[PDB]
Design a protein around this ligand. Sequence first.
Ligand SMILES: Nc1ncnc2c1ncn2[C@@H]1O[C@H](COP(=O)(O)OP(=O)(O)O)[C@@H](O)[C@H]1O
Ligand SMILES: Nc1ncnc2c1ncn2[C@@H]1O[C@H](COP(=O)(O)OP(=O)(O)O)[C@@H](O)[C@H]1O
Ligand SMILES: [Mg+2]
Ligand SMILES: [Mg+2]
Lengths: 69, 370, 370
Amino acid sequence: DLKGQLAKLELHLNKTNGQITATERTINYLNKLKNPDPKTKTQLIELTEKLIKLKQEFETTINSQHEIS
Amino acid sequence: TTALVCDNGSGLVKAGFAGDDAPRAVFPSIVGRPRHQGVMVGMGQKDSYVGDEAQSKRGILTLKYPIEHGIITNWDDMEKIWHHTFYNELRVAPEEHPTLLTEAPLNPKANREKMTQIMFETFNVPAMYVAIQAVLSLYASGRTTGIVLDSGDGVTHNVPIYEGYALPHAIMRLDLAGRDLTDYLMKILTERGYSFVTTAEREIVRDIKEKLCYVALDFENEMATAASSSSLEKSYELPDGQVITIGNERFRCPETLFQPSFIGMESAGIHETTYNSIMKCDIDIRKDLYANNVMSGGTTMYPGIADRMQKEITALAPSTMKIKIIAPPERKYSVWIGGSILASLSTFQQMWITKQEYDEAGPSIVHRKC
Amino acid sequence: TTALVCDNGSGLVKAGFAGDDAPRAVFPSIVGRPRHQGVMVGMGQKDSYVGDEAQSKRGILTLKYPIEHGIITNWDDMEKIWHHTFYNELRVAPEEHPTLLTEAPLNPKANREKMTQIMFETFNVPAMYVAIQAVLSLYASGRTTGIVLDSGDGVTHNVPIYEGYALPHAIMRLDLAGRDLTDYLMKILTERGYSFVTTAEREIVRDIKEKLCYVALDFENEMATAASSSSLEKSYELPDGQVITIGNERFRCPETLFQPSFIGMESAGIHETTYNSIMKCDIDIRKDLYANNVMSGGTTMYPGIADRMQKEITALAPSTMKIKIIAPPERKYSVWIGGSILASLSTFQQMWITKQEYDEAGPSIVHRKC
Ligand SMILES: Nc1ncnc2c1ncn2[C@@H]1O[C@H](COP(=O)(O)OP(=O)(O)O)[C@@H](O)[C@H]1O
Ligand SMILES: Nc1ncnc2c1ncn2[C@@H]1O[C@H](COP(=O)(O)OP(=O)(O)O)[C@@H](O)[C@H]1O
Ligand SMILES: [Mg+2]
Ligand SMILES: [Mg+2]
């Protein structure tokens, strides 16, 4: 069971990292804009918050995986 | 919902979902048909293999490429490729999600219409959009002012943009790409004794190209060094347990890019096309385009292409101007990485072409924004 | 002085002097080695027969071909052939006169160097030159604009020229020639009961091919006519007083030229290669090449090949365009007839490679003009 749950934790960590990469790329594009469309102004904030949430989720997942180890 | 972002290419198919960092599936765009009789009973007949299974069983198949030079020649094969991508590879029904496709600039009009019809009447997607390959690169790069230099298989094109105002008269297109380099590699490998003729042997030559090639900083000096000594030699192994030994041909294949007269063509090297594109724009924006060059496509993965590009452009361009070649890693997927970003954007979610719009307006709809 | 013009071929050797209308000597390029013990005393043990005497005593010899597919495989046998040609056959010492040789296009580099060394260090000729087989055909034909289609034993190649500017990227090469036809003739003669296995039996099959073969204008109708009636039957006599009776196989052997899928190959017929070569040149010169086609080599002596070639090319090529197949008689020696003419020309007498030039520059000399 220990090995299986460790594997599932690894998979979840991989998925989280994959999401972080895309969100960072989108924010990197959106930052350069100078007079963004009103919708983009809110989308930028939404993405900025989502990146944070994903980062703490990643920290928690890696901490749990290490604790199993 | 998630919007698929397929990139039908000239030599590979990359299909995936929006909001990702890599294509979900990647596989060659070939169709193989059996060549021999077939003697065993029970096997279960198959008219044609498609995708990677064809690449696996290349021994007894006649591989064909439905696309060439960006244009699409065979339509049944392309429809087969699309069906395989949507059902067998991605494993998602196409009805629920929209779709985003990419098409190279200056292509024939009819292509766009036929693609639209095949993506509405037969597959029944609720909304489809098509974008220029070069433009999507700048989203992945992360800037707005630049001159992309997408160089895929089949063709290579240059599209300069400034503050998000694409200049259409400075766009350039050229038909020198990886397939010509593969053919030249076969032709020059003929000298040492190794003779490759069949299509599968061409596939082997393509792998040889991918693994063992590089671009010399200077050409004549490299020839002199390779002729005098014997240090520029590499050994490769065929599937049949035979060893090829490549010498000069390591840097005579990609050199065709900068000297298109090897193949009998007449156009100028790619550095000259980039410089001409830059000098075909206005006077006030040339400095910015010099500052930010961009590379994309698989063909620009040769070790040392960035250095030679920078050196040649610096030699051609006036002094007092600073030139950088933004050449990030993982450039291979750069175009695709743009599309997913473009799909994610909230504003872009208003720019699709709904099915009823195409039903009412007609085929011309797609060209209104062309 | 007179300059020898030898044409080392893939299945025949033709050697002669300049300013003539035919080769002085012509003989097969084979080497026969004895197979059995030898019981009589006083005969004097020879180790290998060479040339025509081997063909005379094929009963108790194991005939071998030093050349294959243009490339030279065995070098001792080739040197023996050259020595026999210069001393026993021509009966002229090689020191006094220069020499002109012919080599097919796209062959390995090493061949040229080794031939040069064997023609300088060992035989000590005062000057040697080597020329492409296809080019010499145009001197014999009498024109300058054309697309030769030399088809010798071993291999066949196409070289289009326009105003004496050979296009190198349009050259085509293919490994379908008379030897494959002989093997196919053996394989299909197997059906009726006649079994030929040994090398001398292959030599007999080659004679059967030479005498009784032709090319049908259309294939399916010819097969139907041959099956329905019994008029397409011929009787031939073996050396052992036995009678073979050939039917359909009369026109299934040469048909392999236009349908290379009979022997398991994958390339296209020769008409398709000619059309592709023509359509790989520039737009403005295709008409002249269409007008003036040329054939050479022994393999193109099948009765009716010219008509089928013209019909196929006319069907493939666009209308409004006039096609002729210049197919003069005595085409067998056409290539050789070129060389002698090339030797005679006063200008050409400045282009040899003197012995001291090779001694100083080194082996690379020959390749400078390649
Ligand atoms: N690492 C590499 N080094 C050199 N050439 C490469 C490399 N990867 C791919 N290529 C060349 O690029 C071609 C594939 O291009 P691709 O990325 O499919 O362009 P597109 O997406 O427009 O079809 C291949 O045919 C291959 O010859
Ligand atoms: N009259 C003919 N009819 C049919 N085939 C022929 C004829 N003469 C020669 N051949 C074929 O051509 C071959 C000889 O080719 P050759 O003219 O020697 O080419 P090369 O000069 O390049 O060696 C022979 O093997 C034979 O099978
Ligand atoms: Mg691409
Ligand atoms: Mg010949």
